[PDB]
């Protein structure tokens with residue numbers, strides 16, 4: 001476990017435009033009626049009633065940059081203190097260079113600042129925290145930024161075009177339906193060596209389990225995402241269960257002994273199936289997919305930032321970060337407030 | 338100075354893409370555009386110094402090429418996939434935005450449910466980044482073995498760039514901006530890293546230094562079908578950045594150029610490379626180049642060259658090997674291997 005790693009600052013950005021599921025259903029209504037769809041899958045089943053979109057021409061790096069500036073302020077440090085910047089977003093503007101280098105350019109990092117991207121679907125932010133934690137413990141750097149901006153504008157625009165086409169089949173509809181559960185947003189975290197920030201929350205790290213045989217289940221680019229919803233739910237929960245059992249071992253976790261559960265946000269049935277598996281008090285599980293949908297790897301730190309801004313947390317509170325992503329990969333870690 | 342301790346290279350391999358595409362063939366297609374634009378010099382063969390590059394079949398994905406390299410690297414290290422505790426994929430090429438290419442490679446190989454996997458992306462320096470991340474886990478003893486894998490696909494950028502540049506209405510500016518795309522190449526590499534205790538006679542990786550100039554992030558921008566590049570400015574600002582990195586390399590690695598045995602350098606063109614070696618007083622006999630026949634294989638370039646050096650019998654026990662590169666960003670990293 002990490003002994004000397006802390007969270008110096010934390011921030012999130014909510015995207016400014018609301019697209020409700022009611023509004024999407026009115027667009028999709030003529031398709032529903034020719035396919036004989038009678039059910040509201042988004043609202044009544046998924047539990048997603050709205051999501052947020054950016055203005056046009058907002059790139060991932062722009063969103064991440066906004067979040068990074070807020071996080072530095074939350075941490076009371078200047079950019080010149082940053083020795084490492086990692087971008088963990090799924091959304092990316094180019095293959096080359098790293099989105100991190102674009103964010104770093106915007107921010108004005110020093111010539112000593114190491115930067116690169118990590119990609120791992122919705123788990124990448126936790127991955128990013130661990131890579132930074134290891135560099136901090138080793139004394140390579142004092143402060144690190146982990147940043148993540150997500151943009152779903154184009155995937156809504158293109159998916160809605162496809163779904164409204166007179167040639168669309170129910171097979172294609174059900175297979176791209178998951179794209180209509182995603183949302184825009186951004187997050188950023190400042191991590192630091194603990195001797196520099198004695199009042200800050202401590203990050204202990206945690207455990208990782210994987211099921212890489214299921215890598216075909218959810219495949220996506222900026223304009224299109226194809227998903228096997230049923231199997232992904234079933235196998236995703238199986239891996240989460242396996243990882244949580246492994247966590248109870250090495251982290252000493254017992255459900256009653258935890259104050260907050262910061263979980264990846266994908267759907268109401270997904271969530272309820274997991275909490276029921278372990279008898280977790282749903283009150284302890286903050287949910288935002290209702291109005292924000294799935295913000296990918298930024299989801300977990302967004303919720304954690306919202307919890308912080310709420311003035312919820314108390315010193316000594318044990319917070320379980322429960323991350324997962326298409327892969328499948330699952331990582332569960334502990335933060336002590 | 339925080340150099341890595343007891344981190345070793347247990348296995349190493351490269352894959353050469355099978356189909357040769359010559360610059361003579363490319364020039365043939367481009368000739369009408371050259372003539373219309375008044376270009377009278379062979380800018381590929383004579384200026385950039387690239388005579389050939391390799392391509393895959395159309396149906397080969399980044400993960401496919403990385404998987405080929407990985408299996409060969411495991412054989413080299415004489416271990417099974419069940420030993421691997423970490424797999425990092427470092428390629429610029431990728432199958433999708435999500436999931437990671439690493440998880441596709443990991444699924445192909447059959448890694449255990451304890452294996453940690455993800456992609457790292459950082460233009461042409463990412464393989465060194467992957468080695469560094471693996472090394473930190475290995476040094477702590479969190480894992481015993483790691484795989485760092487990298488497959489590059491340039492098929493689509495060749496196809497689309499050549500169509501655009503052979504268009505009746507291509508502008509001189511668009512032509513110049515995209516020309517560097519025709520110096521790219523296909524190929525793959527993978528390395529098995531291990532705790533030194535398990536492989537007492539294997540080479541040692543020490544890590545090294547990194548310096549950056551992220552205000553130059555616009556100079557080279559790439560996607561699956563297009564790459565736009567300011568070649569002139571990349572040369573000038575690259576050497577500048579490499580100069581800072583060498584000063585740092587003397588501080589933490591204690592480097593003196595005459596004392597190093599091999600320089601394994603990421604390469605973007607023949608004149609760029611000669612400028613680099615001239616700038617820092619490097620013995621050219623200690624610099625192997627595959628650019629003339631393979632072009633620029635991005636982040637796989639460094640380990641592909643290292644693997645070829647091993648296969649040529651040019652590396653012996655105790656040889657001090659410098660891994661050097663400038664990557665779009667800009668970033669520059671310099672690390673040492675002791676064979």
Ligand SMILES: CCCCCCCCCCCC(=O)SCCNC(=O)CCNC(=O)[C@H](O)C(C)(C)COP(=O)(O)OP(=O)(O)OC[C@H]1O[C@@H](n2cnc3c(N)ncnc32)[C@H](O)[C@@H]1OP(=O)(O)O
Nearest residue numbers: 039041045046090150155174177178221222229267295296
């Ligand atoms: C560019 C990147 C940006 C970047 C943005 C950042 C994100 C990047 C990261 C990638 C994000 C991903 O991995 S997204 C992958 C995770 N998200 C998802 O899988 C979305 C799916 N969400 C869900 O809540 C679920 O799987 C449901 C709602 C689809 C099914 O729930 P569940 O309870 O089985 O439902 P079950 O009873 O079958 O369903 C009963 C009823 O729902 C209907 N139903 C069930 N499934 C479907 C379906 N797939 N499509 C249509 N309808 C369906 C049935 O017909 C039936 O209707 P009837 O009999 O009443 O008529």
Ligand SMILES: CCCCCCCCCCCC(=O)O
Nearest residue numbers: 121122236240270274325326
């Ligand atoms: C821990 C929550 C349990 C339900 C989550 C199942 C995993 C769904 C996979 C989608 C992850 C992603 O958005 O990349």
